Amino acid sequence: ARTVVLITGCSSGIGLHLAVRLASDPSQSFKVYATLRDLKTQGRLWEAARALACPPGSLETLQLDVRDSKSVAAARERVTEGRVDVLVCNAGLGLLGPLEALGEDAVASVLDVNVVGTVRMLQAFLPDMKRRGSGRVLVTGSVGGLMGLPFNDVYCASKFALEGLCESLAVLLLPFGVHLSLIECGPVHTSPEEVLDRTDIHTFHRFYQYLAHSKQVFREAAQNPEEVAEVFLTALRAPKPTLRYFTTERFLPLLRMRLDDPSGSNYVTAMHREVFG
Amino acid sequence: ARTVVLITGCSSGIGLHLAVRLASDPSQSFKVYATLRDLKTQGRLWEAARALACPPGSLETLQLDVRDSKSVAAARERVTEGRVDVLVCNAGLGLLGPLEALGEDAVASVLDVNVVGTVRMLQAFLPDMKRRGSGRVLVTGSVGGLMGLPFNDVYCASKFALEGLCESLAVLLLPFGVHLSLIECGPVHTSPEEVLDRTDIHTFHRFYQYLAHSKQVFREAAQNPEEVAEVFLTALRAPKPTLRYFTTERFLPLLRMRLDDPSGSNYVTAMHREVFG
Ligand SMILES: C[C@]12CCC(=O)C=C1CC[C@@H]1[C@@H]2CC[C@]2(C)C(=O)CC[C@@H]12
Ligand SMILES: C[C@]12CCC(=O)C=C1CC[C@@H]1[C@@H]2CC[C@]2(C)C(=O)CC[C@@H]12
């Protein structure tokens, strides 16, 4: 029997690279259900799949919108094996800008996709894993889920939310045989005018500085998606997986500083200087 | 000029005690706008206010539903002074139970009130604080926002979400003169049949154990609301407030263990043993 894997958010980035890495594995051990919110975006996945020569039947695409529990249930029903060995909750949205410049709908959407959509996947797929006493859940996390980043208030809110969701579930799942793990990613290679109308000139200037700083960190530290995707595989094959895997060690010093001063003052000062010099 | 304070969620608990502590201050330095989602619940606030003899005009109630940006805007307009010196984002919901037993609407509501509602308060009130270069924002946090608790997956999700929201905003607000702080609270003195239908017998049994453990921690460690409310006041009067204040030192050892093993394995094991013995 092959390992059945269901991944959300496979139109690009991590989810696309992980789906074709697993489907193309030389051992042919995995059957992958790559899900996408809109099947019109599946072309890059099929072009990457052909390039790694995934065997016929190793990869299938399903439409799955994690904002809708009916779409979640109908994709679950399309899993012909009647079981999901590995569930990868990767679907996600970013949101960048002055908090007061973000639309209310955009805010609600980031939380609904990143947080409620993961809850909807877990409600639909966990019960069967708990009953069989086996199953692996991998959740794409971010450094933004471990420490707060300026102008990413809502995005960070949603990634910190996943840390608390997963850690709470991990405490309960320990003796059930169901393993949950977050894969903590740094940056990965994957109008000024409207913002200026919704904020003050100083905040706008600080946003510019954040953006110039961010592009520089990205240019210097973004990892290839193949390297990040391999951390998922490592977590998948660990006999007793930990709650968190880190794709890089680059942000651990910032992490440790944050974690060693619970008042948060050292972190706030250090991150303001790191971003705004 | 009096310090104008606007507090959300004042029908009971922390928000009710803080509103009457501030309005009854012997110095008469504060004017409090105590807001409630449903004004039919304001009786306990007025009974507590009379008992502490808050002077006439020291305390006013406004209806404010943080799920609705129109209700947020109309309460802002009722602030006759045209300024809010201290904003207290305290409105919040709990959610307890097996993740698969929680209704989709209940999940969405906890996030919308606890997380999006705080975002809506900050969008409505921050810009004026940034323009004046002064203002204090206090957010009620929880130990459940710092570490994951079994059967509180969504509640923890929402409190961790506030940590990432506030920390992200704090990094930007540092030089603006606007101070944001989380007040980290432990427990504070403030049908089996439907759950059994939505989960397995083992999860149900574990829920019972969590509940018996929780009631015991509460009975032994719940703090009086007057003590918790005073930590808000302390943060309010600090000339250079920190990002986080802790109402107690009881959970710091668990916190430190969690923070010293980034893999999360020590935390998961220690919390499973603490709750389930
Ligand atoms: C937001 C971001 C860039 C875009 C991206 O794709 C992934 C990340 C995560 C790491 C962020 C970084 C931007 C700059 C940050 C604030 C730092 O100085 C340290 C943490 C780092
Ligand atoms: C959920 C809870 C009880 C009800 C309440 O009102 C506030 C809290 C926060 C502290 C929780 C506690 C329940 C039991 C927990 C899991 C522990 O063993 C350590 C942390 C503690």
Residue ranges per domain, chain A?
1-277
Question: In this structure, which residue's CA is closest to atom 3 in ligand 1?
Answer: A214
**Is B161 near ligand 2, meaning CB less than 6 Å away?**
no
A263: phi then psi, degrees, rounded to nearest 5 = -65, -25
Three-class secondary structure of residue A32 per DSSP: strand
| Residues B268, A144: C-beta atoms closer than 8 Å | no
CA torsion sign for A13, A8, A111, A162 is negative
Distance CA B227, CA B120 (A): 28
Tell the residue number behind the tokens 């496979």, with chain if given: A10
Tokens of B247: 């109402």
* Count of positions (residues) in chain B: 277
Q: What per-residue string of b and e applies to A151-177 under the rule 16 or more CB within 10 Å gives b?
A: bbbbbbbbbbbbbbbbbbbbbbbbebe
| Residues A163, B165: C-beta atoms closer than 8 Å | no
Q: Which of B99, B138, B172 to mutate to test the interface with A (most CBs of A within 10 A)?
A: B172
Please provide the CATH number assigned to the domain covering A1-277: 3.40.50.720
Order the strands of the A86-89 sheet from edge to edge: A59-63, A30-36, A3-7, A86-89, A135-142, A178-185, A244-246
Chain B neighbors of A267, CB-CB under 8 A: 167, 243
Distance from CA of A221 to the nearest CA of B (A): 21
| Residue in B closest to A252 by C-alpha | B262
Distance CA B23, CA B52 (A): 9
- For the purposes of burial, counting CB atoms within 10 Å of the CB of B182, is it exposed (0-12), middle (13-18) or buried (19 or more)? buried
| Residue in B closest to A270 by C-alpha | B171
Three-class secondary structure of residue A182 per DSSP: strand
Contact present, B61 and B10 (Cβ < 8 Å): yes
Distance CA B47, CA B136 (A): 28
Question: In this structure, which residue's CA is closest to atom 1 in ligand 2?
Answer: B214
If phi > 0 it is left, if psi is from -120 to 50 it is alpha, else beta; for residue A64 that is: beta
Say which DSSP state A64 is in.
Answer: -
CA torsion sign for B32, B33, B37, B40 is positive
Sequence-separated (6 or more) residues with CB below 8 Å from residue A64: A8, A35, A36, A37, A71, A72, A75
| Residues A99, B202: C-beta atoms closer than 8 Å | no
How many other CB atoms sit within 10 Å of the CB of residue A244?
25
Sequence-separated (6 or more) residues with CB below 8 Å from residue B253: none
| Residues B152, A168: C-beta atoms closer than 8 Å | yes
Sequence-separated (6 or more) residues with CB below 8 Å from residue B5: B19, B22, B30, B31, B32, B33, B84, B85, B86, B87, B88
Q: What's the farthest any 2 CA atoms get from each other in chain A? A: 60
Q: How many angstroms separate the Cα of A142 from the Cα of each of A160, A277, B23?
A: 9, 23, 43
Distance CA B90, CA B222 (A): 18
Indicate which residues of A carry an active-site annotation: 155
Distance from CA of A21 to the nearest CA of B (A): 25
Q: Which of A172, A182, A231 to mutate to test the interface with B (most CBs of B within 10 A)?
A: A172
Q: Is B109 annotated to bind ligand?
A: no
Distance CA A131, CA A138 (A): 19
Contact present, B156 and A168 (Cβ < 8 Å): yes
Nearest to B164 among A160, A200, A269 (CB): A160
Contact present, B182 and B245 (Cβ < 8 Å): yes
Distance CA A86, CA A32 (A): 9
- How many CA atoms lie within 13 Å of B7's alpha carbon, on the beta-carbon side? 31
Contact present, A135 and A88 (Cβ < 8 Å): no
Say which DSSP state A148 is in.
Answer: -
CA of A97 to the centre of ligand 1 (A): 14
Tell the residue number behind the tokens 């240019």, with chain if given: A219
Question: In this structure, which residue's CA is closest to atom 7 in ligand 1?
Answer: A187
How many other CB atoms sit within 10 Å of the CB of residue B237?
10
Tokens of B52: 């502490």
CA of B219 to the centre of ligand 2 (A): 11
Distance CA B184, CA B139 (A): 9
Tokens of B21: 């502590």
Sequence-separated (6 or more) residues with CB below 8 Å from residue A229: A14, A17, A18, A21
Beta-ladder partners of B185: B142
3-class secondary structure for B69-97?
A: HHHHHHHHHCCCCCCCCEEEECCCCCCCC
Measured in whole angstroms, the distance separating CA B273 from the mean position of its chain's CA atoms is 27
For chain A, breaks with the C atom over 2.5 A from the next N come after: 190
If phi > 0 it is left, if psi is from -120 to 50 it is alpha, else beta; for residue B130 that is: alpha
Order the strands of the B178-185 sheet from edge to edge: B59-63, B30-36, B3-7, B86-89, B135-142, B178-185, B244-246
Contact present, A65 and A40 (Cβ < 8 Å): no
**Is B209 near ligand 2, meaning CB less than 6 Å away?**
no
Distance CA B172, CA A204 (A): 11
Distance CA B137, CA B120 (A): 13
∠ Cα A195 B140 A251 (to 5°): 60
Chain A neighbors of B259, CB-CB under 8 A: 259-260, 262
Sequence-separated (6 or more) residues with CB below 8 Å from residue B101: B194, B195, B198, B199
Tokens of B18: 């803080």
CA of B181 to the centre of ligand 2 (A): 22
Amino acid at A258: R
Render A80-145 in DSSP notation, one character per residue.
TTS--SEEEE-------S-GGGS-HHHHHHHHIIIIIHHHHHHHHHHHHHHHHT-EEEEEEEEGGG
Sequence-separated (6 or more) residues with CB below 8 Å from residue B217: B187
Q: What per-residue string of b and e applies to B187-202 under the rule 16 or more CB within 10 Å gives b?
A: bbeeeeeebeebbeee
- Residue A209 parent element (H or E): helix A201-221
Distance CA A18, CA B251 (A): 39
Nearest to B111 among A116, A150, A260 (CB): A116
Sequence-separated (6 or more) residues with CB below 8 Å from residue B248: B186, B221, B223
CA of B215 to the centre of ligand 2 (A): 8
Beta-ladder partners of B188: B223
* Count of positions (residues) in chain A: 277
| Residues A147, B167: C-beta atoms closer than 8 Å | yes
* Secondary structure E strands in chain A: 3-7, 30-36, 59-63, 86-89, 135-142, 178-185, 244-246
| Residues A157, B264: C-beta atoms closer than 8 Å | no
B223: phi then psi, degrees, rounded to nearest 5 = -95, 155
Distance from CA of A53 to the nearest CA of B (A): 35
Contact present, B49 and B16 (Cβ < 8 Å): no
For this PDB entry, the determination method is X-ray
**Is A98 near ligand 1, meaning CB less than 6 Å away?**
no
Beta-ladder partners of B63: B36
Closest CA to B186 of B212, B158, B214: B214
